[PDB]
Amino acid sequence: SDLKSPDGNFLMHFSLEADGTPVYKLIYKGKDVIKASKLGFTLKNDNKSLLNDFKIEDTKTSSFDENWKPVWGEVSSIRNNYNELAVSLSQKETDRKMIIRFRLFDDGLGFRYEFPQQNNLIYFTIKEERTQFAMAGDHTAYWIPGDYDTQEYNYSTSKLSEIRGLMEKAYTKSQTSFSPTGVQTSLMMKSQDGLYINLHEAALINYSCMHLNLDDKNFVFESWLTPDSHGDKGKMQAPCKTPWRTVIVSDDARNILASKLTYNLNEPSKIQETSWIKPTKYVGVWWEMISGKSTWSYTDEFPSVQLGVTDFSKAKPNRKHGATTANVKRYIDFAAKNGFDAVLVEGWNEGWEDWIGHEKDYVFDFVTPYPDFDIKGLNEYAHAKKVKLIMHHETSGAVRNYERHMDAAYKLMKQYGYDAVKSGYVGNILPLGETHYSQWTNNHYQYAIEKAADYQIMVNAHEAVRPTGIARTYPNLIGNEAARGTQYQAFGNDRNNANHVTILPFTRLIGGPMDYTPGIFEMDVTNGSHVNATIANQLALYVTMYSPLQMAADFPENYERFADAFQFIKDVAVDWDDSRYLEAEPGQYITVARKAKGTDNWFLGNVNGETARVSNIDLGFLEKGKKYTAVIYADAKDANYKTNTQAYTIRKVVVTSNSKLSQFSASGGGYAISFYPVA
Amino acid sequence: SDLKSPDGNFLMHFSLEADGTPVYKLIYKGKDVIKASKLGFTLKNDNKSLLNDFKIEDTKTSSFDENWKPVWGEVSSIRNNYNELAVSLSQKETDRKMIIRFRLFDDGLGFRYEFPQQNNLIYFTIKEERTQFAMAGDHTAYWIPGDYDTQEYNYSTSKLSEIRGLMEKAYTKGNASQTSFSPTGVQTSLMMKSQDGLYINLHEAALINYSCMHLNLDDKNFVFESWLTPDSHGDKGKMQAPCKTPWRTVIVSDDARNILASKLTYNLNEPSKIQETSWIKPTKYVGVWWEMISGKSTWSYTDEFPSVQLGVTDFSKAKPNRKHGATTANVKRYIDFAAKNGFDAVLVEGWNEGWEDWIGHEKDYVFDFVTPYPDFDIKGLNEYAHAKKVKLIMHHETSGAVRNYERHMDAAYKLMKQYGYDAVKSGYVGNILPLGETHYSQWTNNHYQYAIEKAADYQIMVNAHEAVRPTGIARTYPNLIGNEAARGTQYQAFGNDRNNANHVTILPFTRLIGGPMDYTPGIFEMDVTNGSHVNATIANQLALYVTMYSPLQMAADFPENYERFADAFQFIKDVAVDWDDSRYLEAEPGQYITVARKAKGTDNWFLGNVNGETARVSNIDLGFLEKGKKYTAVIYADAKDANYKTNTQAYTIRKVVVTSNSKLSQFSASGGGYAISFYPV
Lengths: 679, 681
Ligand SMILES: OC[C@H]1O[C@H](OC[C@H]2O[C@H](OC[C@H]3O[C@@H](O)[C@H](O)[C@@H](O)[C@@H]3O)[C@H](O)[C@@H](O)[C@@H]2O)[C@H](O)[C@@H](O)[C@@H]1O
Ligand SMILES: OC[C@H]1O[C@H](OC[C@H]2O[C@H](OC[C@H]3O[C@H](O)[C@H](O)[C@@H](O)[C@@H]3O)[C@H](O)[C@@H](O)[C@@H]2O)[C@H](O)[C@@H](O)[C@@H]1O
Ligand SMILES: [Ca+2]
Ligand SMILES: [Ca+2]
Known about the structure:
Chain B: Its cofactor is Ca(2+). The structure is a homodimer. The first copy, chain A, has 11 helices and 36 strands.
């Protein structure tokens, strides 16, 4: 019946209502966080469903406290410490068995449903999941519109009661909305009385992606899963279980960011030997096309292309193509010179003339280079300079087409020494009517990952479902996008709000890292769009947007122009033995310092929102009795993300654990700091 | 503007109506066979579509006459002889280009639409094809209901005007997957006979990268119109120019026998793309099969479990339900039998984990196509078969889970090669997943195509049950050695009405146009374990090895039953499965077929008669035999009192010496037939 966090700060009461509805309640430090909340499911072609009429057949309690070592991460060792309540339910009349399993951590609550092997529930279909989160009042939320096909929205900050009226505008126009009060997870909130509340899920395997629908009379969120192509919300087979649903809570917003709860609820690694999994700093032939300077395509001779018919070797080059042998060489040369691990190349393969908007099945083959891209020479050239290429497999939504070519594509990767692939799923999923985050498409992303692992290939999947901690289980999933990235800074309209990167950690990053592609130095790009950041904001992102996969997205020539600033990007690590969140408020600021794996050096970043601010940090995370050379890369006092983006200062100062530092950060600005011991 | 067959029998007039609608008209021996008939398409989200407002921009004529050698077939050489008219159309306002290409053979008409590379039509979606066949009168038709997911129906014989009223009855239920569309909708191949004695077949050829064509009848004016199969989004073709439709075919003769002889369907398919074809082997086989179909055995190994989960359920530790057919001991019996009687192969079904959930669960991860049940020793059985000069046939039932088959496909074909399986029988029982998809859409059609093409890269032959009905594609991929794609012998074991007695006198004039069927003939025990009565005589069952052409021929009954009737079984052991020549001697759809074939590479002939509801005396000329030579004929016939309902196992066998000048007179019972081997002295 009742359950406590190890530290006694959380209490979860579970009971049944008069009619047999199962309900839960969560309490933090004597405060209601989750009020009485119903659980269970509406099932298709089922009189009675799984909503009510249960009895408690048994309860079982236990405790767990172990550490595991991530392959890559924010810390060298993570603590998995919880108390567990398993409630076995039995429904009257049907005698169907449903377990609700709760784990209560010092960071908050996770729960899931289990269906054991039984006689009167075998194959069933979920019409709707009926999992509630009753809020204590009209909290502030940081939210994106509920959508079955994209998460690439700017966040809105508002009360819960304002979501309805704001939904006309926040839903900017592959996308499918569902409700005027529907929102995605991870969802971040802050109560009128200073509690930070995160609703999300963990271990999204073999199940549809959960969104939340708000009842804005009573402030109750309810699970609203993603329909597949037939409109269903889970083809289930017992014995089976749901992903966990997570309520991470703290009176200190920094603890939300530091939580490993999401990972903790996923199964331990299923990869036995993990040393081939290598955190990666990279450049690429990428932003050129994103910002309208180059094309993915080789030719414009043809209205459409047909692979195996169009003869590319005899087509007129349009001469805008980014992925030329000469251009890739330049990026290789730049990566090698500056200690980067890899270079991504997009537009390398036949088919880019028809990549977007055509709902085209046989859109790519994932193996055949354009005539102007010498796959063999370039891979040899890169390896000779101690660099790798990153394979790119945009699918343009044609999932069957990808699965058929996948083995051959991974083989070709291995044959030329590619160990990582950036995938994509742009456009409607084929065949039309399918959604990007259904149980059905979710299984594709899962299969891609699993198969990549069999080849010892790493995967970074754009346009896929947002992560839910599955990289603990498959640490070859070194990234996704699955949110609005730097690319939108090049797409005109509103680009990304100045405070975007002060919300992403509190939402999107819960579940796993993002390939945000930071590192922009020229904010006014070829197609006229204005990147809403300062240079110092861009340097800070290598620390404030944690990821084992970190791009420097701008052109070689722009880094050359601002070589002094670029030093931080060259110096910063991408893997860590420890991390300390120093300051954080969603929508406003994040400051964090991290200690580079296998070193005694630290790197710090600050990102700042709309309101310019003076940050004051304690350098207590440094080792006692040591001196460090700090180099501080900061906004100039008149820097500004709209009108003065390229104004930064660089200064050196020797510091100790007892030093304090005070730093202006501009509007949409930030700062970065390297700390190296003195010898 | 006008076109003739090489022999002058057919004239095809093409015109445009006052408003620019394209129309065609087909005339046989001065008689209207296809009246003025509209052509073009309704396109989705398009102002104007492709229905009218065309002008003729150009026409082009040509002729073609060459022979090709099939890998397997009814004849050693096939003649491809036609005259061609290509009409380039251009639409007003949009300036879109559409070519209609016509080929006129001595056997009839084929036409298709082509879209060349152009500026104003790239990506488009067909909402409906508007291709008509205006009939000359209220013909007699032999038809099954139009359906997106099964062709497993008994045929009906009726006037066109009677189709609507008969449709409550001909649309029989209890199928795992079936979806009707119209009270006057029918499938192709569709066979007809006019009130005045012409035989008319409507069908298509080269069903590639396009949705399967059905026909909807307007029974006021006797006009059939193309009604294609919707995909999961309701569309009837995601197209990209340059592209083309399959051909639409109107096969006509005043002699029913010429419909059966026509190679027009094959002629309209592209030449073989398999360069080296000698691994492609016509096959006579038995199997662990009918036992399960007739309710004596199971496909499943255990009944301990409500459901099974592959990779979780430990089968090695489950209670055998003890009904499982594909035991090591039982397969060995069929291997022993096959080797003893000169059969090439043995099919085995239920060999692999997952059969406990194979039907009606709409289950994705239903099979893995590689993991044997504990009671089936894959390694030993394959070695035992090869040691006795026999092969196994792999079975890959998918249970509708197409993505699950595609993901396992390479590993499954690899495993075939590792153990010396060179042919696979596939299945698509149950609704295609994910729900909403149909068995004959453009999308699922592409899967069947991919399975065949991939099989070819592995030098594997394919036999696909529940797939789309064939359209001559085996010329291009002769590793497609069969389909079912119609109501086969299995329904003889499924109670209800089983198969009408005249079923096999209609299939050749309908289903067989496009390619062979794995009909699984050869039943000697007509009263089977589950109580169902097979509607045939023994002699009918022998005849089918000749009257139902296929390079893949099963003897579906149990070893026991063939040994019991060993005298009759001789014909099955003797009969060939590939032919240098064939002659249709008599044929009338729904009533009778008699045909003789010459075994490839030999001077031996084999003949079969199958007979419908009415008992009849057949009277044939043996002139197909070589002049001046004597043959031992053995005639396996119905006894006088044989009958498909009440006296199924009564046959006579007599030997007689014959020449090209012999004439034969032979009674065939109701649902009966006769079979004859001719060997030179
Ligand atoms: O691979 C397994 C077999 O699969 C195909 O045929 C199976 C056949 O199953 C169902 O028909 C069975 C039958 O069950 C009776 O009890 C019932 O009265 C009857 O109506 C029902 O149809 C599906 O309905 C059907 O679509 C399917 O064809 C192959 O063709 C077999 O050779 C193969 O062994
Ligand atoms: O694989 C390529 C690309 O795929 C994802 O990007 C998705 C993105 O695609 C569209 O926008 C691309 C945009 O780029 C240039 O600016 C062109 O010049 C434009 O006309 C074109 O729209 C779409 O508009 C977006 O809404 C969509 O999210 C990856 O995330 C990328 O990193 C990758 O390069
Ligand atoms: Ca994107
Ligand atoms: Ca069947």
